[PDB]
Structure formats: structure tokens, C-alpha cells
Amino acid sequence: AANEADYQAKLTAYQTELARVQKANADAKAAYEAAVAANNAANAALTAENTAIKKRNADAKADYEAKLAKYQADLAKYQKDLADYPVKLKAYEDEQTSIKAALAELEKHKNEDGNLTEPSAQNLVYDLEPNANLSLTTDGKFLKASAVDDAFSKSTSKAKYDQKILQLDDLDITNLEQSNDVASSMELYGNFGDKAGWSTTVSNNSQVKWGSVLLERGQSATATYTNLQNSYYNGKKISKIVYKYTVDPKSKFQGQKVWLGIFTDPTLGVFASAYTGQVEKNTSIFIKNEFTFYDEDGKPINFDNALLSVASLNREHNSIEMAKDYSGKFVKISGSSIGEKNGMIYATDTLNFKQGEGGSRWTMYKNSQAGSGWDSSDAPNSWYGAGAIKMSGPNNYVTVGATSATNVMPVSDMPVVPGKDNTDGKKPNIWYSLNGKIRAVNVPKVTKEKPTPPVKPTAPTKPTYETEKPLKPAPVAPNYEKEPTPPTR
Numbered sequence: 001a002a003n004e005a006d007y008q009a010k011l012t013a014y015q016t017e018l019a020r021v022q023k024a025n026a027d028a029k030a031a032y033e034a035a036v037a038a039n040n041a042a043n044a045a046l047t048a049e050n051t052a053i054k055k056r057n058a059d060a061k062a063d064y065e066a067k068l069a070k071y072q073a074d075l076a077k078y079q080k081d082l083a084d085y086p087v088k089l090k091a092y093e094d095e096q097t098s099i100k101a102a103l104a105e106l107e108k109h110k111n112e113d114g115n116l117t118e119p120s121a122q123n124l125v126y127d128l129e130p131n132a133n134l135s136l137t138t139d140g141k142f143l144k145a146s147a148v149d150d151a152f153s154k155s156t157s158k159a160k161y162d163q164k165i166l167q168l169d170d171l172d173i174t175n176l177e178q179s180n181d182v183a184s185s186m187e188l189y190g191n192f193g194d195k196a197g198w199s200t201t202v203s204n205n206s207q208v209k210w211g212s213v214l215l216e217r218g219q220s221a222t223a224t225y226t227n228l229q230n231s232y233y234n235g236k237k238i239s240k241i242v243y244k245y246t247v248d249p250k251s252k253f254q255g256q257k258v259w260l261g262i263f264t265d266p267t268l269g270v271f272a273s274a275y276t277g278q279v280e281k282n283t284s285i286f287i288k289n290e291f292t293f294y295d296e297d298g299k300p301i302n303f304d305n306a307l308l309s310v311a312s313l314n315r316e317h318n319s320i321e322m323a324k325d326y327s328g329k330f331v332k333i334s335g336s337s338i339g340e341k342n343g344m345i346y347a348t349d350t351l352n353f354k355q356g357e358g359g360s361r362w363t364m365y366k367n368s369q370a371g372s373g374w375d376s377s378d379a380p381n382s383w384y385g386a387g388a389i390k391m392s393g394p395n396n397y398v399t400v401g402a403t404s405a406t407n408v409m410p411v412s413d414m415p416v417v418p419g420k421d422n423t424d425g426k427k428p429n430i431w432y433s434l435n436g437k438i439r440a441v442n443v444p445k446v447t448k449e450k451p452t453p454p455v456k457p458t459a460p461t462k463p464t465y466e467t468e469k470p471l472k473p474a475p476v477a478p479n480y481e482k483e484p485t486p487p488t489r
Ligand SMILES: [Ca+2]
Pocket: 311, 312, 313, 314, 321, 431, 432
């Protein structure tokens, strides 16, 4: 019995100790598991973070190399321009000095025939653009090329048409006023394509193409000319021109419609007509012109006394072609029949159709007389029917048109041409163009652009790389203590 009691006492001690050791390990395991949880959360986040870090460094690297490609190019252009700067500037200064001297010399002849009364250089080179592209908007009607062709083949222009000639001033617009003549967009017509061997009254040294529209008073067509290759302002390339043509409500042509033929070559101008087959007395047709020239960057060019040519201002015994309501200042060419009166530019004192008639000095068309044929782009004395307008600013305008003489002055103030009636009706149409082809003689031209100081590009900011962090090592397994040995009797 004594042993048994002893054994039981030892047994109790064992059981209690065993319990302690177990609870101790259980708590030890609880901690280990908690450590494992944290370690796993740390690595999981560390992995996802390292992956992200890997991505960012890749992007930063790529974006950087992308900036270097652009930099490498801009830097190459900068160094090149800086190298050329002095040579370009020299050409500029040299020409400016040359122009200054030419102008001083011209001062001595400013009152001689063909000379601009107020000596000036022409900083606007704008006179030939055969490859120009035309795009039109309008609040009027676009006319099918086939409709224009059919119109030329009928009525008053038929005789010429059958002779392979497109006589614009004979075109009867009566046949362009039907709904079936309206096109869904601009269409070109002229002596090209299947009519490449035909003649037109617009030019006799080149093929011409034009888009057509039918407009009423107050309606307009806005032409955007691009792909210009030979035009400049102060030597800087002119890449685009936006020109808006509006039918002047004050036009007195009979009827409500006007045919507008806009040539793809902007320097060729436009043909405007309300001619319906018969001449009209007390008639007129005026077209308002609003235009802006743009540089290569699409920025409007702010003219500084550019010279706009206003030529071929015909004045017959019963008809006056004129320019009015214009921006800028009129500059007269000495000896020219063209002057300014009552805010209008035209042959103010004499006619200019035939020498000896109405005080005209020369005949507009070629004949047996010396100096005849002044009305042509190449005539040496084409200045006889021309003048100029000095313009400044990015937005300029001028209204050009033809009107019966009786609308401008009483018959009593008119030149008399024996055998001709000054009240004779006329056709309400006109061809005209506004460009930089000044007809005055020896006008100095600006061809060298003043270079701007090259702007050095900035090397791209170095990429910011981040390092990936080392993954955390797993927790160490705890060393659980042994359990006591049960006692024996
Ligand atoms: Ca003319």
C-alpha cells in the first residue's frame, strides 16, 4: 500500500508536468504559425512588389530610349542649323543691303512710266502655283463637272465649244440653275483630262482646272489652297491660303444666280458670271474677297506692307472693271491708266481698250500699233492697266467686279468714242485674280529669309531605376521539449 501511495503521488506529478509541457508546446506552435503567416505575407508582397519594380524600370527605360530617339534627331537638326546660321544670315543681310540700294536708285525714276510712284520692294512672291490643290466649302451649290460641260456645249458658248475652246465669258449660266446640276461635292473641269488639248480664255500657255459653284447674293465659297510650291513672304515659305469669295449683294445683275469658277491655281483667281445670254444695261457683278496666307506651321502670316497686284482693270466705252472696299493703301504706277477715285481703283480718267479711243494710250489687244496687247501677264506695259495695294496684317480683303459705266458716273462725264454708245449693255461677268505679280518695272524682290537663332534641345532626364528587394527567409521550426516518462510501481 505504501508503494501504491508513493506511485500515485509520482503519477500525479507526471500528469501535471506532462500537461505543462504540452500547453507550452501548443503556445510555442501558435507563435510559430503566426510567424509563418507574417513571413508569407511579407514575401507575397515582396514578390508582387519586385515584379512591379521590374515593370517600372522597363517602362522608364523604354520611355527614356524614346526620348533619346527624338533628342538625337532634334540635336542633329540643331547642330546643322547652327552651322548654317551665319551663311543664311549673310545672304539675308546681303540682299537687304542690295534692296536698300536699289530702292535709293528707284527714287530717281518714280515718276517715269511703269514705275511705282512710291518705291517699294515686293516681299511677297506669289505668281505661279500650277500644282496647287483646292478644297472648297460653300453655303451655295456645288456644280457637277458634267453639268458645266453641258452648259459650255449649249447656247452662247457652243460655237467656241465645237472648236475645242472653252470661252468662259460666253457661258450662259441659264443651264447651270437646275437641281440636276448640283453635285455632292466639288468637281473639277477645264482643259485637262479628256480636254487636255483644248484652249480656254483664261490662259494660253497652260492647262487650267476649276471647281464650280452656283451662288446667290450674300452666299459664298471658301477656298483652301495647299501644296503651294513657289510662293514666299520675306523668303519664308507660304504653305496654305484660305480665300473666301462672296457675291456682293449690291451687284446689279439681273436674276438671282451667279456661277463661280475657282481655279486650282490660286494665282489664276476666279471667273464670276451672271450672264444669261444677253447683255444688260445698268448691270454689275462684284465679288468680295477675304484672304489669309499661312506659313509652314499653319500660322497666319502677318503682312508688313506686302504688295498685292491689282491688274487687268479693263475699261471700255460702256464698262468699268474696278476694285473697292479694300484693306491697305493703293499705290499708283506712274503712267498707268489706273488710279484711285472715291475709294475705287480703276481707269479713272480714260478708257484703256483701244489707242485713240477715250484717251487710251495703247490697245489692250495685239495689233499693228506699238505697245498694243498691254493686257497680258507678259506684256512689258501690262502696268498700263494695273496698280497695287500695300497691305499689312493677317486678314485682308478687297472687292473686285465689272459694272456698266452709267452706274459710276453720268454720261456727261464720260469719254466719247465716235460711233459708240456709252449706254450699251454689257455681260455681267468677269475674270480676275489677286496675286503678287506686280506689273511695275524693276521692283526689288525679297528671296532670302532671315534665319532665326537655333534653339538647342534638352537632353532627356535620366531614367530613375529602383532595385528589387531580397525575399524573406522562412521561420525556423521551434524545438519542442520532450515529454516526461510515466512512472512505474
Ligand atoms: Ca481684266
